[model samples]
Target: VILTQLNEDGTTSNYFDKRKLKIAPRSTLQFKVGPPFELVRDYCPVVESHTGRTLDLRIIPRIDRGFDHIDEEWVGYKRNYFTLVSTFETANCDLDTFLKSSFDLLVGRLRVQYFAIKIKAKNDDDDTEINLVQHTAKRDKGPQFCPSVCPLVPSPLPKHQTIREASNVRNITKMKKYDSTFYLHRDHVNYEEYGVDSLLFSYPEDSIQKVARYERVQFASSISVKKPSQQNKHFSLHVILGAVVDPDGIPYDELALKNGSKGMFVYLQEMKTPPLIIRGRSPSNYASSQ
Candidate 1:
């Protein structure tokens, strides 16, 4: 493609890297583009919207006399030269009216389903924790096999049974449940008395509520004006969208942990606290965190 300089300052200056643009199949093009102007911020890449390819060049600046004041406001002058590769799929004549109404309906339906869940669960932030084994069995095992020792001969999971039951084979029969221990880096948690028959309950409340709000129609309008370059060509407007997205890690307001287990423990000199400890009673009695 032949290069054309669309100089904003009407001056021809040395501003481009004179390299031929080369692209490879199943590959990408990269280049160190020169600054467009002496007063511009660090140069960024310009991309072809259709092919999504990077150009192999930089923009040089115009240093002519008419652009002297350009440097004075270099820090403030905004450039509309930035480019992005994109594809526009327009509605066809047969589908235009139908598609437009369809799009409007689709967007409306999406907002109802998307925004409704968070609004209903307003002010709740909670995590849902599930044991990998429990999840796998529920989804994969599906009631066919019986739970047994990892290996019938010898187990990699060393501390499988409580010490009292390990002494005699007869004692093992009396053991109601045992601990499933886990370690994370330097941290630890024990899932106590875990069984295949445990219950899990996290409702689909958020999803149900999200699909029920804003089924009504709405309209909006706007205008703008540019004053003569004397007193101050200023312009502004208000933006009040009924929706917003904050980039917080958690998005839902009513975040609640539906299926959760409870336990308490104190660290002994020899044992580390497990990630989770399931017990019949609380461990809070083992001395306070003084």
Candidate 2:
């Protein structure tokens, strides 16, 4: 992997790093990659299209960079050089358009599904407070059997006034009509409460229309170039999916890619940032700076 640095003057220099290309905070560099760049026909299995009709690739910069999978064999640049997709034409679609589309696709796929329930009622938290503690001390007691044959123990039990009329135990008592409560499904709700004739007045469905979301993605990356360069060059487009952290603390993205794809250089002329300076700096200041 070669990191071709386009200098302030009209010259370009390529840097090589075996680990990751040491890029400056904001620099313009061309990722000159060779070899294993092959035709991605059955390359991606995760996507819906198998014939590679919709196959595309884009490189995105992120805060997180290290992570590993359970099967360490598949690890390399996929586990290290980036992937190549369809060559992007900057003429028809804008740079941001390509980036934005890829960003959107990645977000749709990589974003996690969040499940939420009603935590509180309208009025007060205390009013709707839930008891979360449970007691496990009480164990199960098995059933006990009664005697098969029993004798009348009481002597002169009931000198009958006709035992039925003098029994003292009452029979045929009234019970409550309803027993438990629950949310009414379509089966019980419309037919019982609202009634079948008033289907129009049934519980209102979700009101807000599903609106398409599009964002103009922007990040402070590499040198901002206004004037076009002298020679014709291409910026290899790659999509950055998301910033999801795995259990051990690295995201899905890694340097070791597929098929002996060595992540050779991560480039440029950026030097060390002071550790003492970081340690002494106020945490709030650092947070607000970005």
Candidate 3:
């Protein structure tokens, strides 16, 4: 068999007619990538204030530059440094009572069917109670099979009550309706309601509300800004006199943050998705085999 070589200039060379062949040339591109120039803001949620009258607030990211011993480069800054700058206060000596009621309204929390921070109830004297807007069953639907039946059991007896009279057993099935218990860190809340879809806060509304409100309401007016010096420019962050806690629902307590102010906490970041890499196997191939 004879093999012929083809040329880009539309000329063909036979196996015996070997001529000089040309190959395309290429070069590698090089570029420099330094550390991040601008400050990247971490997860932060929009705050909501519950005062019938607007309360003034501001959230400033407390940022600081640190030396990276590992990467050997100055990386992004860290923020979200939370601190109780001060306690609640009003002009009147009755500020404690006033602030307590206002905070209660501010911290009234809720849960929705789909997403976090659904419909938030207004923080006010008349609207400080937390309740579920809907009822969702957590149990399986439809009738359950009798576990003591002859088909399931090797030897069934009348004592098993598999086919007992309703009047004789005093009822049809001995199983009672499921009563969901409310638990906050292993503490049980006893309630008289037959069906409770939602659990209310067991703490005093006013005090907890106050704590929840301040946790959301942060200050950033004092936040410092660093401008790049390559352009010989500088910038600073200004504090807004009026910014408030933007509640998605009701404020909830963290067992850890419940000591001093009973830290009413919310989240800014969504859960990170873990990498799904299988050892030496492609996703499509594994999926197809499964």
Candidate 4:
């Protein structure tokens, strides 16, 4: 973890640190690099010994992508990804001297602490590569990266266990012959069985109710639902409550909106269909048994 502090003299101090770790001799570290056009600019990878000394790994340039552009003009910068490689000396495998003169700097509160009595050796004859630790210039970004700092802890709210229950109803406000239906896949048997003859809201409770599909001739026109009081009839369209989609069907990414909304929206509407009739038990009783 990297720590940063502003001193009384108006100067800032930084620390680039790491958790206690073991490294195999002749081991290789490989990282699949990507565009670093993000707000903060550099990636710093680190290695630490069980006895406290650490080595700063070096990076080598690999490949580059042409220019980043907008409206067919160059943005002055090109994109590239780099691969860095470093190896530990095999003969003098002493973990203590790994940091050289930098080793003496860490003492007491100001001294760097070392992990004691840890063991490390060559894991494999064939060097295996690993990912890089992201870092920035020593002054700009916070100090050394430490795994102990702000580790990931889950929420105690039982978010996964709690479930939301809402009505399943909707109205197809707009649809085109060429427009795709977010429901069933065209190649699926269910799509052939239903054939867009009618619309329905299928919910987790297994509640299925028919919905009205309003169509328009003008492609530019949009649909609007009238308020309940303003309606001539008691029928009211569903309002969107939530939406979900199959990641396999339309994967989530930065550009999901470019292809239009590709998910199903859960909706709620006023009671429309007659109460479900069953000879054996009441709706509540049947639901409880299942």
**TM-score winner:** 3
Once fitted onto the true fold, the runs of candidate 1 whose alpha carbons sit more than 4 angstroms away are: 1-81, 85-87, 90-95, 98-100, 104-290
User: What TM-scores do the predictions have?
Assistant: 0.12, 0.15, 0.18, 0.13
Report the C-alpha lDDT of model 4 over 99-176, residue by residue, as the tens digit: 222221211212212111100111122222111122232313544321111101011111100100011123334332
Worst 10 residues of 4 by lDDT: 158-167
- Model 3: lDDT to the true structure: 0.20
Question: Candidate 4 vs. truth: CA RMSD?
Answer: 33.3
TM-score of 1: 0.12
Model 3 regions more than 4 Å off: 1-51, 67-101, 105-253, 257-264, 267-290
Candidate 3's displacement at residue 16, Å, is 66
- How many clashes in each structure? 19, 30, 17, 23
Model 1 score (lDDT): 0.17
* Residue 120 lDDT in candidate 3: 23
Question: lDDT score of model 2?
Answer: 0.20
Which ten contiguous residues of candidate 3 have the minimum total lDDT?
147-156
* Superior by lDDT: candidate 1 or candidate 4: 4
Best-to-worst TM-score order: 3, 2, 4, 1
